[PDB]
Symmetry: D3
Subunit: 338 residues, 6 copies
């Protein structure tokens, strides 16, 4: 999959494409409709399936700091776009171009001149051009006889509108199950593992892995979650008895340190039945279900007791998750008990 | 109008004065009674009307950081004092003088030796001297046969005591209309315009002007207000179609950035029907009415829609404000519609 | 009293001891049972009474930053241990030793090899060894025929469990009276006096003393308390009419400054009927009773009036405290009135 | 004078223009040659004189955290352009447009489509387009018989190249005399006066005015300088015996205070005033001495009386030579 | 290769081992002699080759805020150990164990009880036990007929002592050639690429990749260097014309930005790419020039074209001599 | 000894006094001449000896962020005044009073109305009143037949002017020997001991005591010094083999750690102790060596054993000459 930053970077010799346009934050089940429709049509006519997306978030152009939290990083957006069969991602920066352009010149410049589009696919909520004047309707009118438009209704399922907004609200509430339901996969973050307390190994209280994330990263509410931890492919040695590319049952504590801001979130994972230290490795953490809210501990005894209940509850939740195997990892490690 | 910092700076040859004494923060309608009475009496006997005020705030001398927010800056206090006909402002710093003095020596030193007063005007809540021992009553007793005292009752109107305290509560609540009512004018801040997002001009989402204020500045609660933006007299060129000294209809967003403190407040003004960038200019922003609370936006479309409703509501509120012309600006710009 | 940091620092020639083991934070009335039982038994057999305690807090080993607030500093723990007749304190750092040891090797290494114990005294909630496996029960089993164990039930009195946890909750609530009740003494902090506002002396609004404490220090909720201020023995001159080693009646304001963190707490003491400045001195502040919540002041007059009510209420509370003379200071200064 | 942010803000009905192009930081004597040629030309052929300038600095596009110090603010650049009779300033942001463009397109789009220029004026060092391919030469042909180019050599005078760089060098070493000579005027900063050390009045040690400036602002080296302070036009009252729009003799101490951040403290000669809240312009005439620490009141006051005598002399000299002296000023011969 | 944190993590059933002991920071040519002797020995006598190393640095135990810069991360130390055929790394933390121990106990506990070693290999400068009483000598006797000691002298070559210290010295002065010669390989750092100045593509001035490093990381002096950049194995897509696992010629600018903090910005020769989000390895070949400030686009681009020509030459040279050159690389002869 | 903050705190019934006036920072040998003359005089004529001093420093009134470093704290200044037999200290804050006053009024108000002085003692460099008009001369007349003035010349000894300035110079360069000679005693700091590197005990590398000081506190240059450490009187238990009120030989490392901030770390010779929570006084005797970085445990311990031998010698020397040595001390001849 190609990745182009700005119209100027798109190959001039590009001859034909089917194009979809959106922020696509989270690439949720609604987003997958647009992508699927686009990949289908590109296949039919032997064109390339192109996603036009936006970075920075279009909102943050007008309101820096008051931008929506990113359900996925841009990099993960790319990987997800690829995994659903996008051939090329064009990334538009509204501080560079396509901001003040009229709806007409937008179609002319982006869809025709830049992309050589024969088909365009948008959601019914799509807008474009200066002061968001252009709508799904405009696009259909301007594109008459020039290229075909397919406008897809927003996805409603089980009484919930599936959008980036709702996914963010679910995550913020700590309801990763409903977020996963809307995403069509386990919500996850990826990142390098750093040093924490310990000495991950024999000690049940020291995390198997510690990660930190900037405050633009959407993460579930502080608390403990059941999930899966996967060491990403690597040749580097692994301290302990965990193997790369296997999803390991884990109780996950999401926290907020600050006093400082960057209001930095931590993610601390206690991997069930394994003694490992993951420092320096790149690790994926998938969230499956909420287990409990955060609480303060006043003795090691109380703390470890609670830690043990987390593990028990996690084992239960994950044993269930494996049965919903469209969500579950291909290769996993979960012991029936301790 | 003269401005003197400390008793020592007052001209020795000053021969006669009518004096009023208070913090005078906000110079509200109650404060105007004291000032009016003082200016009247000074006119009668051909004396000078003197305001004795305090900086730093007397409270902050005992409780730094826990001082009341300043309804106006000291500089604006001066301008307002002048506008009601004060001839001289004496500024007392309680960390330098007049702090430990007995009520008797206070009258002797300040009113007689320093100011050569023949008339003094205070509010019924006035205190003075070490540990606030002296009252309106004391002042009348000590001044017997030495200079006349006029004690003015605190202003009650429509069931509300008009004081700095109540004005601050109204502002804090976001109720600028009642604050204006108590002030006897539109509450306003003044300050240099800096760079924000954009590029103020054709784009409706980029503010016409961005200003920042330190956290000692009283400002209304975060939200959107209808108000008027006036470029203060200047020879410097103005980017766009706004002229100096004209009050322009504006929707005003008051915000709080931090994470850092100084808990710095922002003020972002969207000037109705104008395309201008005000960087480097000195700008007055008068608040007229609350429009809505702050909210997070998840798409440019949603944001601009809301921005448009702000403008509609602002136009309505301001069209009304012009009719209460004792509050309204002399020269203004308000279009009937877009 | 000896103080040893780590097992290695304990004299090899130590021949016999009676040992108690716990965090002992606050040395509350429950803690005093363990200490009393231990000192008694050590007296009987002519052994030394040894406290084994922990620093850092065992919780913070697993959860740094999320550690319980310290009811007393380590130094005060030592002084209190001494005052109840402990001969030696052994301080264990769980990041250095005794963390991963089995229950069996813990008894063998710590109680026998290191301490030459003939008697050990723990609370029924005691745990030890890797992953807190060992309990009061384990200890009794492992120690069979090797040294005697005495397990003391947790202290319940007036329907309240007396533990570090409950003391912390009382303090956090601002209920120092119940905290004192559980501690068996007035809760107190000690620290150097620094400069504040003023000029402690004739001015009633300037504190007699200002102290700051780091955010790991447990302190009552922000507000005003009645208490006693004692200048610790010193040869350094004292500005004003307070003498060293006398407990002086004081109204105490506990505050939180930040914006910055270290979320630093202040303690400002207004000593009744005295004019003194305590800069540079080391001062103990004992808390006796809650007087009022914190509030913002908008005039010096209002502030001083409230200050006067604080003093009146304090005089009342302290006059009562003197009658409960098991709590009260040996040598005190309290005037019947102003 | 109009100010346009980006090509899109330019009036579509712009008939005809004479254009000059550059960063124009400082608007020094070399810059003034370009503007003069442009203004003289435009007034002749009926047309508007346009300056195309850049913000942020083209260097800062590639080297954030490594951009040259602003000799003047962008606001002062506008004011200086207007004073030399420019009719419109077009401000180009290289992160938005005109950056990755070819030389060929840059000309047609900017000079032709946007500005409809008959005449362009650039300095011999002018570069443009993608990776700065376009040069003083590129320009003269690419504009064949459409618009009349005019290249002006960089200014040498007294063996010295006059450029933004040399001005920045002169300032950096505290040689304000040479900076001014290159600028064609007193170097100045403008800013709101805040509270600082004590209160301005009878005391010689408390500054008449205190100002702070961000670290993007070029200031002379830390030290004391002779200069003039002006209260900008205002109806706000002035505490003390100073009125607006008169340049008052002052000794000026420039200090650094990390964490930015530069300070400017003005001791106005023979005045008792406190200028808190006013906007104030401070012009630098000549360097007086380096910064130094003090450990007694006597010593500090002694040196400050020397600063004052030194300032009187240097400023009296500035009044003769006359060319850069203020129109209305206040300078006493004696204390 | 196994990694054990503390003596307690070592498999109790560890039959027999050949052990080497040291900080091993940088795993330089002197270090490689120790590992070689250890690995060759262990493969012979059926046994496992073990490295005992230290984290945190033994100096940092006594001098926090004053610890020497890490030539490599602990993670890279593991990777280097494994590449030279070490079977297990035992990481000792002196704040937890082995610190206040006598020389006598250190041997029995670590080499005997924990590691069950028949053979130990240390450098002639080896010290241990309480207050470093134990030395190269202490070791040879205390291990009498139990385990066969083997002391190796520090490496001198070309009149130069090869040690972590001299490597740190070479890096500090920007002499990467000498650092590499002492290391037996190109010095490198590895890190996630973040966003920085602009976007990597057609523009020569926007870096292909931007990385920041904490102040514990040894980096060469601020300046420009010739080097190779490798995208580490990945299935993530790559924006632009670069694939993973090929070393691409690059000019590398190393910068400092307080408050830590070092930056590494790579301008990959003859490529248009943006490597945001990828893990990237940057090897340093030779110093090109010191850091310098710029005040025009032309100037900055001019110097950067010089950096590129200079890099081509130096890297072509690195391809001959051959011994440290990358296996798979990309280097064009001409622009 | 009484302490009065401001003229208003002085007992109205103050009958008669001999007064000395100055900053008195450090209370050095020059200062001691003033106090001696004042104390000897007052004990004679039945009266109280008064010191008028200043806080904040008179320089800091005009130059905030530029005030000279305190040779001692204000608290230590009180303690030193008392030790030389001053009966009352009057602390004047120039932001509150006595600042913009004329010379004439300063005398009548301070010396006459407030202090009711018969005798004043100042140094030949004394200045006062508005803009320091009043001088050693001004004083002798303005006090005509009311109160007997007495001016004392600044102390020269061994070709050296003894002043707060020269003391600050001596400290700054790390020459504590000369500072002490000028002070008439060992320079010292006093402070609460906190936790730092490791735990104080058997290990030579972990300091017996760790202290930090704000940047207003004058400390010797970064380096190692020979000195004495005293635990101030206390009933709090002491971990280890040290008792209060005995000066123990120590090697003292002074460090800087931005962002203030100075550190003082004491390695007490031949003791195993940890002094956390105690108030501790540290006296500086002689400079031993400059600061230096370490990169091995052996090296660091080696140098520290040298520091110890060096300290023993220097401190044994301090015990002879005798004049500044502590009354009760602990210094072993050998390890």
């Amino acid at each position: 999959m190609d990745i182009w930053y700005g119209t100027a970077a798109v190959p001039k010799d590009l001859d034909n494409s089917a194009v979809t346009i959106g922020v696509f934050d989270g690439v949720h089940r609604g987003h997958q409709k647009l992508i699927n429709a686009t990949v289908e049509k590109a296949r039919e006519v032997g064109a390339k399936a192109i996603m036009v997306t936006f970075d920075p978030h279009p909102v943050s152009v007008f309101l820096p700091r008051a931008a929506p939290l990113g359900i996925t990083t841009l990099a993960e957006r790319f990987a997800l776009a690829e995994s659903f069969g996008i051939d090329g991602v064009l990334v538009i920066d509204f501080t560079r171009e396509l901001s003040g352009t009229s709806p007409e010149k937008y179609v002319e410049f982006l869809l025709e001149d830049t992309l050589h589009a024969s088909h365009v696919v948008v959601g019914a909520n799509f807008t474009f051009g200066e002061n968001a004047a252009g709508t799904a309707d405009s696009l259909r009118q301007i594109c008459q006889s020039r290229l075909t438009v397919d406008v897809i209704d927003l996805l409603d399922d089980e009484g919930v509108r599936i959008s980036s907004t709702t996914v963010r609200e679910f995550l913020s509430e700590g309801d990763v199950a409903r977020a996963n339901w809307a995403l069509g996969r386990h919500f996850y973050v990826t990142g390098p593992v750093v040093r924490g307390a310990g000495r991950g190994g024999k000690e049940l209280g020291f995390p198997t892995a510690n990660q930190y994330f900037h405050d633009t990263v959407a993460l579930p509410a502080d608390g403990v979650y059941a999930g899966w931890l996967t060491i990403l492919p690597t040749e580097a040695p692994v301290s302990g008895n965990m193997e790369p590319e296997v999803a390991y049952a884990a109780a996950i504590s999401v926290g907020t340190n600050p006093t400082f801001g960057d209001e930095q979130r931590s993610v601390e994972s206690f991997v069930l039945d394994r003694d490992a230290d993951l420092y320096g490795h790149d690790v994926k953490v998938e969230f499956v279900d909420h287990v409990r809210a955060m609480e303060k501990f006043d003795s090691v005894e109380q703390l470890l007791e609670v830690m043990a209940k987390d593990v028990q509850k996690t084992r239960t939740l994950l044993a269930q998750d494996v049965q919903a195997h469209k969500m579950a990892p291909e290769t996993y490690f979960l012991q029936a008990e301790s």
